[PDB]
RNA sequence: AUUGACAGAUUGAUAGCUCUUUCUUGAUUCUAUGGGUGGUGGUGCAUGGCCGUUCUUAGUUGGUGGAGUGAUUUGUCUG
């Protein structure tokens, strides 16, 4: 269910959706938003 | 398996209720069958408890004996 990256062989596995963690992001448009973070987080781009 | 939710959608609603979408939750719960659970739902003509009223008045029982075949009476009475 965390299979959706750009997977690679020998031996690196590169990731997608770059996190900005409070003390992986949803992506529809502009904003990045973190699921687990209890206070909800917004940064447009 | 179920949960928390941004900005729009939708809504009185800064209830993510349900969503167009996509991040998360980590076995608490969901799915159905049986069965519980709860109610200022019905019944005071199924009841308890409490209160009012009959009744602010003076009244009410049984023990032994007497009367009567008996229900009952006498005691509880003329003054």
Short mmCIF file of N, CA, C and O (backbone and C1' of nucleotides) in Angstrom, two decimals, chain A residues 2 24-26 33 35-36 40, chain B residues 4-6 21-25:
data_model
loop_
_atom_site.label_atom_id
_atom_site.label_comp_id
_atom_site.label_asym_id
_atom_site.label_seq_id
_atom_site.Cartn_x
_atom_site.Cartn_y
_atom_site.Cartn_z
N UNK A 2 2.06 1.21 0.58
CA UNK A 2 3.14 2.15 0.28
C UNK A 2 4.03 1.74 -0.92
O UNK A 2 5.19 2.13 -1.00
N UNK A 24 3.83 10.77 4.55
CA UNK A 24 3.82 11.20 3.15
C UNK A 24 2.63 12.12 2.87
O UNK A 24 1.59 12.01 3.51
N UNK A 25 2.81 13.02 1.90
CA UNK A 25 1.88 14.14 1.69
C UNK A 25 0.84 13.80 0.63
O UNK A 25 1.14 13.10 -0.35
N UNK A 26 -0.38 14.29 0.82
CA UNK A 26 -1.40 14.32 -0.23
C UNK A 26 -1.08 15.42 -1.25
O UNK A 26 -0.50 16.45 -0.89
N UNK A 33 -0.08 18.53 2.06
CA UNK A 33 -0.85 18.29 3.29
C UNK A 33 -0.52 16.91 3.87
O UNK A 33 -0.59 15.91 3.16
N UNK A 35 -1.08 13.72 6.54
CA UNK A 35 -2.22 13.01 7.12
C UNK A 35 -2.13 12.84 8.63
O UNK A 35 -3.07 13.15 9.35
N UNK A 36 -0.98 12.35 9.09
CA UNK A 36 -0.80 11.96 10.50
C UNK A 36 -0.67 13.16 11.44
O UNK A 36 -1.07 13.08 12.60
N UNK A 40 -3.24 20.48 11.27
CA UNK A 40 -3.23 20.36 9.81
C UNK A 40 -2.31 21.40 9.18
O UNK A 40 -2.30 22.56 9.61
P G B 4 -13.92 9.99 13.20
"O5'" G B 4 -12.45 10.62 13.16
"C5'" G B 4 -11.81 11.11 14.35
"C4'" G B 4 -10.60 11.96 14.02
"C3'" G B 4 -10.81 13.08 13.02
"O3'" G B 4 -11.44 14.23 13.59
"C1'" G B 4 -8.78 11.95 12.55
P A B 5 -12.34 15.19 12.68
"O5'" A B 5 -11.34 15.65 11.53
"C5'" A B 5 -10.42 16.74 11.73
"C4'" A B 5 -9.58 16.97 10.49
"C3'" A B 5 -10.29 17.66 9.33
"O3'" A B 5 -10.29 19.07 9.52
"C1'" A B 5 -8.94 15.84 8.55
P C B 6 -11.22 20.02 8.61
"O5'" C B 6 -10.16 20.80 7.71
"C5'" C B 6 -9.16 21.66 8.29
"C4'" C B 6 -7.96 21.77 7.37
"C3'" C B 6 -8.16 22.60 6.11
"O3'" C B 6 -7.92 23.98 6.36
"C1'" C B 6 -6.94 20.58 5.64
P U B 21 -13.94 10.48 -7.31
"O5'" U B 21 -12.68 11.32 -6.81
"C5'" U B 21 -11.34 10.78 -6.81
"C4'" U B 21 -10.33 11.91 -6.76
"C3'" U B 21 -9.04 11.62 -6.00
"O3'" U B 21 -8.08 11.00 -6.84
"C1'" U B 21 -9.96 13.68 -5.25
P U B 22 -7.17 9.81 -6.29
"O5'" U B 22 -6.45 10.45 -5.02
"C5'" U B 22 -5.41 11.44 -5.17
"C4'" U B 22 -4.79 11.77 -3.83
"C3'" U B 22 -3.98 10.64 -3.19
"O3'" U B 22 -2.79 11.15 -2.59
"C1'" U B 22 -5.65 11.35 -1.69
P C B 23 -1.49 10.22 -2.42
"O5'" C B 23 -0.95 10.62 -0.98
"C5'" C B 23 -1.05 9.73 0.16
"C4'" C B 23 -1.15 10.53 1.44
"C3'" C B 23 -1.15 9.73 2.73
"O3'" C B 23 0.17 9.39 3.16
"C1'" C B 23 -2.88 11.35 2.80
P U B 24 0.42 8.08 4.05
"O5'" U B 24 -0.60 8.25 5.26
"C5'" U B 24 -0.18 8.84 6.52
"C4'" U B 24 -1.37 9.08 7.42
"C3'" U B 24 -1.74 7.94 8.36
"O3'" U B 24 -0.93 7.96 9.53
"C1'" U B 24 -3.70 8.88 7.37
P U B 25 -0.83 6.67 10.48
"O5'" U B 25 -2.33 6.48 10.99
"C5'" U B 25 -2.80 6.97 12.26
"C4'" U B 25 -4.05 6.23 12.66
"C3'" U B 25 -3.89 4.74 12.91
"O3'" U B 25 -3.57 4.49 14.28
"C1'" U B 25 -5.82 5.15 11.56
#
